[PDB]
Amino acid sequence: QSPELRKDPVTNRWVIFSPARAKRPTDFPSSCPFCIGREQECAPELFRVPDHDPNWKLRVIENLYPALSRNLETQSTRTIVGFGFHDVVIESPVHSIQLSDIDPVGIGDILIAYKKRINQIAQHDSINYIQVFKNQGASAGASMSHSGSQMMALPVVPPTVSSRLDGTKDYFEETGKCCLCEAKSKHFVIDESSHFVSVAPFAATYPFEIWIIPKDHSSHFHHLDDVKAVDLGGLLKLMLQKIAKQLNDPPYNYMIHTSPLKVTESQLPYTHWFLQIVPQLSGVGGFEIGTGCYINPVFPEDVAKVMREVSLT
Amino acid sequence: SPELRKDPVTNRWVIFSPARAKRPTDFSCPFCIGREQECAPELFRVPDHDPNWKLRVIENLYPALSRNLETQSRTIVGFGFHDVVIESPVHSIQLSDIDPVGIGDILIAYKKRINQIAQHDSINYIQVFKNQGASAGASMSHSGSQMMALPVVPPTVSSRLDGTKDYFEETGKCCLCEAKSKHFVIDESSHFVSVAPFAATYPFEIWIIPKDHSSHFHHLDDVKAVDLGGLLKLMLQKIAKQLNDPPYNYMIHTSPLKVTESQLPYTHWFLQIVPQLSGVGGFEIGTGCYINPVFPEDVAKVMREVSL
Ligand SMILES: Nc1ncnc2c1ncn2[C@@H]1O[C@H](COP(=O)(O)OP(=O)(O)O[C@H]2O[C@H](CO)[C@@H](O)[C@H](O)[C@H]2O)[C@@H](O)[C@H]1O
Ligand SMILES: Nc1ncnc2c1ncn2[C@@H]1O[C@H](COP(=O)(O)OP(=O)(O)O[C@H]2O[C@H](CO)[C@@H](O)[C@H](O)[C@H]2O)[C@@H](O)[C@H]1O
Ligand SMILES: [Cl-]
Ligand SMILES: [Cl-]
Ligand SMILES: [Zn+2]
Ligand SMILES: [Zn+2]
Ligand SMILES: [Zn+2]
Ligand SMILES: [Zn+2]
């Protein structure tokens, strides 16, 4: 098909769609420290679920090799000290269980644990943005094969958030509308649950990228409630299981995109959180490193069609 | 001990964190001489119209953007030029093995192609880049680089214009004119200086920066082409020795084709070299903020001491 450039407020950048790219030739542990019974081999615990239960289903712990130091906080008040929080979420007691294998309720409990930790961190005025994310598979950057995700509290609003705030503001000012409240008309619907919808994003950065989006206008992920957590957990699991089947269990990353902690009232109407899932299908080269512009070999129209047709029976 | 650093050129914070490097882990061809019929249409060669060619610039067979959608121009048509620069008649030679003169010819080719392209009002920015090695993204094992001409100025060019502008407004200075006092000098030639950038995105990243204030790469002349050739050869060879011949990417950062007069005083082209040492995860995809396990102070001391 013919190449196209697409833009979206959320990314606030163009992406190249070009399927002819896919047609080019080319010349080229049963336990771990995260496993139950081995807690003393981990950096300190923040909490577990159930609370203080020796028979835990998840734990939220400090990252033992953290990118940022929680002990540089008061100094945090072209260079700034490397203060922040880096935590790990152990999603299973069993090494061989993956996130998508967990049932909706349990996935919901992991989501509520994200929520609890965000709320702890947000008591610090030094923190401006909290990034939750998950790596599964070596080529998606994973170093622990055990099923886990991570949280990184930042003293600064990072560039995707600045970009999204600018793009979503411009769209609100031109149309009066939150672009994500209009996800069903602006993007390609795959599946829908009671409170969330998953779409293939119109101006998708990566092939088979998927966004899961609250249908209600909701600025902060941390505003998630128990009922919405189980509903999101089922939709997240479905999207992961449909990805696993259709694309032959590739590695993936997922990333919650949420509100800055100090979001202003005037930002609220066009600030709407979402969950981004990127199956790891290939790397980038010099074009992308040079420009910050990506090349996508699959149109989201085709992703949605295919992903709608996926049968998990 | 971890730290955040910013630079007007990236216009973004990067996180330096050396502890991160301690964590454990559980884990012939169609471009060769005479096979030109197996290639997309030639744009030119060097020497010009010589059957005994040294380099060729040709159309990309599987283009990201179509050179045939020009009149047609949340959506725009996928118009642009996607060109391949074949760097050798021979398959086993890699760019860094070429002599400074021959590397300069490649750099002069880039400039000639740039200037062909700048005759198109439809075009706003041209990205010259190279991939060497499968993990840096290569599909053709033959030595080659690429040119992507875009109808719009892309995110890093916008960030750079913004960040270099703010710095110029704050200081009256062009920040890359201050390279020797802002970054960590590794090597220097008659007209270029190579550095480990202060707020480098990637471990072992190196910039090659004209010492004269020069907004466009394509203003390169024959003398500077050879001078740059040798400094680029030198950095590529130092990387291969120090770092056990890793894959790499390099990227020319240059000015938009329609750069305004008032943007000139703070607009300064440079060549970025990124040895391919690590991948990203969800933090970088989520935020667009990177994590760099090696301070540029440390890269520069190591690279100064490499002997070939
Ligand atoms: N005993 C222990 N107790 C507590 N924590 C322990 C531990 N042993 C190991 N850890 C931590 O566990 C984490 C596991 O994380 P992942 O496997 O998701 O990817 P990682 O963060 O290594 O790297 C990927 O994700 C990061 C974040 O995006 C990228 O920067 C990087 O390039 C990519 O490879 C590591 O951060 C590690 O420090
Ligand atoms: N017979 C022929 N005639 C003309 N051209 C031919 C040809 N046969 C192959 N080609 C082209 O030659 C190029 C070889 O380029 P590279 O090895 O630098 O990486 P490639 O562009 O494949 O992908 C890497 O670079 C891009 C851009 O940075 C990333 O998007 C991508 O993920 C990464 O793998 C390809 O672009 C291909 O289209
Ligand atoms: Cl939140
Ligand atoms: Cl140029
Ligand atoms: Zn384990
Ligand atoms: Zn909304
Ligand atoms: Zn060859
Ligand atoms: Zn300058």
From Swiss-Prot, chain B:
A Pfam family reported for this protein in Swiss-Prot or TrEMBL: GalP_UDP_tr_C
Residues noted as binding Zn(2+) 1 in the record, renumbered to the chain: 29, 32, 91, 142
Bound cofactor: record note: Binds 2 zinc ions per subunit.
Record: active site: 144 (tele-amp-histidine intermediate)
Statement: the UniProt record of this protein carries the keyword Phosphoprotein: no
Cofactor(s) for this UniProt protein: Zn(2+)
Domain of life per record: Eukaryota
Catalytic reaction annotation: alpha-D-glucose 1-phosphate + ADP + H(+) = ADP-alpha-D-glucose + phosphate
EC annotation from Swiss-Prot or TrEMBL: 2.7.7.-
GO MF terms held by the record: ADP binding; nucleotidyltransferase activity; ribose-5-phosphate adenylyltransferase activity; UDP-glucose:hexose-1-phosphate uridylyltransferase activity; zinc ion binding
Residues engaged in binding Zn(2+) 2: 174, 177, 213, 268
Binding-site residues, ADP-alpha-D-glucose: 20-23, 38-40, 60, 131, 137-140, 146, 279, 283-284
SUPFAM superfamilies: HIT-like (SSF54197)
GO terms under biological process: carbohydrate metabolic process; galactose metabolic process; glucose metabolic process; positive regulation of cellular response to phosphate starvation
Bilayer-crossing regions: none
Keywords noted in UniProt: Carbohydrate metabolism, Glucose metabolism, Metal-binding, Nucleotidyltransferase, Transferase, Zinc
Note, other: Functions by a double-displacement chemical mechanism and ping-pong kinetics through a covalent nucleotidyl-enzyme intermediate.
Job description of the protein: Catalyzes the conversion of ADP-glucose and inorganic phosphate (Pi) into glucose-1-phosphate and ADP. Does not possess galactose-1-phosphate uridylyltransferase activity.
Subunit structure, interactors included: Homodimer.
Recorded family membership: Belongs to the galactose-1-phosphate uridylyltransferase type 1 family.
UniProt name for this protein: ADP-glucose phosphorylase
Organism whose genome encodes this protein: Arabidopsis thaliana
